[PDB]
Design a protein around this ligand. Structure first.
Ligand SMILES: *[C@@H]1O[C@H](CO)[C@@H](O)[C@H](O)[C@H]1NC(C)=O
Ligand SMILES: *[C@@H]1O[C@H](CO)[C@@H](O)[C@H](O)[C@H]1NC(C)=O
Ligand SMILES: *[C@@H]1O[C@H](CO)[C@@H](O)[C@H](O)[C@H]1NC(C)=O
Lengths: 29, 480
């Protein structure tokens, strides 16, 4: 049922910030 | 053996300097300057005071097009001959106009956005920001020729541009003008009569090129006008003086020989580097003089590859020389020339840094290198904190003053402004008229903290280690 959707060009900052924080906390831990 | 490598590095320096001497030719800045003054500085009208650099509305664009643009493109015919039919135009009696200029636009679709249901009565039309997924691909208006019909990117042989607001595609609604002013003006008037630039247009490109047979140097001119979704007009331009007929004179043969010698030098350097790494010192990376070597080799290989790619792919000029009444597509060549120039510049910059390996001849120069090597670690350690505080200030400025000052409109712009403040290159005006509170507070705190604390801390870090190294060397010399 996979679609390979969204050929659109946009950026969602919420997901990027969450992932960056979750990686930085591991790096400092 | 401190002498086999020194000589072959001075030879490399000589070859590189010879290469960039002919690459950056003289009497080239004046050519671009004259073109820029002719096109971007002539007022759009005799009674008007605006030029291309200060376009303010879609009505000003139409005044510029059928106006200061046609005046600079189709110069006089200098009538002294038969003038059989539609004689060509020399822009400065020296600059030949190649082919014919092209104009094109990129627009969006009426049913793009989604206005809220609360006020869906007083709002009838809406157009979203430019995007590939929200592009118009249907005939509009008098669907008669190629100016009212979409034509895909592959059919124009175009590519992206990466303008100021977004990255525009290579497709759109285009039109090729005529070779004489009396016909190009008629075509533009016909385009303007029945509206061609509606409210849904997002960008407009105008492209042409010139030759200047005196000094063999082509020049491609591109002018872009961006219409953002929020209104207004943003102009941009580029004038690239590229060359395509290199081997005409003996100096070009000399430059080709120098390029061949440079390729041989790069091959020798990469062979010796791989020979060293294959057997000796399988770690090899704790010296800071080997990362520079691999960086130089990689950059030089990339430059050679780009040069070969953009020198073999010159079939566009051959195609143009068959039929000279067609638009010459010379944009990829200019893009690759810009890329090659950047790569060559950074490589030339890094070679002079590599030069540092050999200035250690006398004792008074050994202590300076020793001090730098000993203090680099602490300098990096403090630079981490310096950059963290700098970025905190930059993000605060971006979030506070980033919508009104036009100097903090972007994070990069905030960083550049904060570096310029250190230079004492700030006006202190737009900050305070932007906000009478938290305006001067930010400036005062930034100047105080940054300048005093961090500059003096850097000075202390360098001075302490310099004094320690000098005292250690003096004691060792006096005790031996
Ligand atoms: C654009 O679409 C709206 C409804 O989505 C419609 O009312 C309007 O007439 C359309 N305009 C054009 C020029 O098609
Ligand atoms: C539309 O095409 C017809 C073809 O016969 C031509 O006569 C007419 O001038 C054109 N109108 C334009 C280009 O506005
Ligand atoms: C694009 O490339 C094709 C392929 O050679 C060529 O025939 C054509 O003239 C070029 N330009 C346009 C506008 O199609």
């Amino acid at each position: 049922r996979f679609v390979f959707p969204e050929p659109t060009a946009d950026v969602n900052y919420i997901v990027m910030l969450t992932c960056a924080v979750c990686l930085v906390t591991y790096m400092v831990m | 053996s401190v002498l086999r490598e020194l000589v072959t590095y001075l030879l490399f320096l000589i070859v590189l300097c010879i290469l960039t001497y002919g690459m950056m030719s003289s009497n080239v800045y004046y050519y671009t300057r004259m073109m820029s003054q002719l096109f971007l500085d002539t007022p759009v009208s005799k009674t008007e005071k605006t030029n291309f650099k200060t376009l303010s509305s879609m009505e000003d664009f139409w005044k510029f097009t059928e106006g200061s643009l046609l005046d600079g493109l189709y110069w006089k015919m200098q009538p002294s001959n038969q003038t059989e039919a539609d004689n060509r135009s020399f822009i400065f009696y020296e600059n030949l106009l190649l082919g014919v200029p092209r104009i094109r636009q990129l627009r969006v679709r009426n049913g793009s956005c989604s206005i809220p249901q609360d006020l869906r009565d007083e709002i009838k039309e809406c157009y979203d920001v430019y995007s590939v997924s929200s592009e118009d691909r249907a005939p509009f208006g008098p669907r008669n020729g190629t100016a009212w019909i979409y034509t895909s990117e592959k059919d124009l042989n175009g590519s992206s541009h990466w303008g100021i607001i977004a990255t525009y595609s290579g497709a759109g609604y285009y039109l090729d003008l005529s070779r004489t002013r009396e016909e190009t003006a008629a075509q533009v008037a016909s385009l303007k009569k029945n509206v061609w630039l509606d409210r849904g247009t997002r960008a407009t490109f105008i492209d042409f090129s010139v030759y200047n047979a005196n000094i063999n140097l082509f020049c491609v001119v591109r002018l872009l006008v961006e219409f953002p979704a929020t209104g207004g007009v943003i102009p941009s331009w580029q004038f690239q003086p590229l060359k395509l007929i290199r081997y005409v004179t003996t100096f070009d043969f000399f430059l080709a020989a120098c390029e061949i010698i440079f390729c041989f030098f790069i091959f020798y350097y990469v062979v010796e580097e791989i020979l060293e790494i294959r057997i000796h010192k399988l770690h090899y990376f704790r010296s800071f003089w080997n990362c520079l070597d691999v960086v130089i080799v990689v950059l030089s290989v990339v430059a050679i590859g780009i040069n070969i790619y953009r020198t073999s792919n010159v079939e566009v000029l051959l195609q143009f020389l068959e039929d000279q009444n067609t638009f010459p597509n010379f944009e990829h060549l200019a893009y690759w020339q810009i890329q090659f120039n950047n790569i060559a510049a950074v490589t030339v910059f890094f070679v002079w840094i590599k030069l540092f390996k050999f200035i250690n001849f006398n004792r008074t120069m050994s202590q300076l290198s020793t001090t730098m090597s000993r203090c680099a670690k602490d300098l990096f350690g403090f630079a981490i904190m310096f950059f963290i505080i700098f970025l905190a200030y930059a993000q605060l400025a971006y979030l506070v003053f980033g919508t009104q000052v036009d100097d903090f409109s972007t994070f990069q712009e905030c960083i550049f402004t904060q570096f310029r403040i250190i230079l004492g290159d700030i006006n202190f005006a737009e900050i305070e008229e932007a906000n009478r509170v938290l305006g001067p507070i930010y400036f005062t705190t930034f100047v105080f903290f940054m300048f005093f604390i961090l500059l003096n801390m850097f000075l202390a870090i360098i001075n302490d280690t310099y004094s320690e190294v000098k005292s250690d060397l003096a004691q060792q010399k006096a005790e031996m």
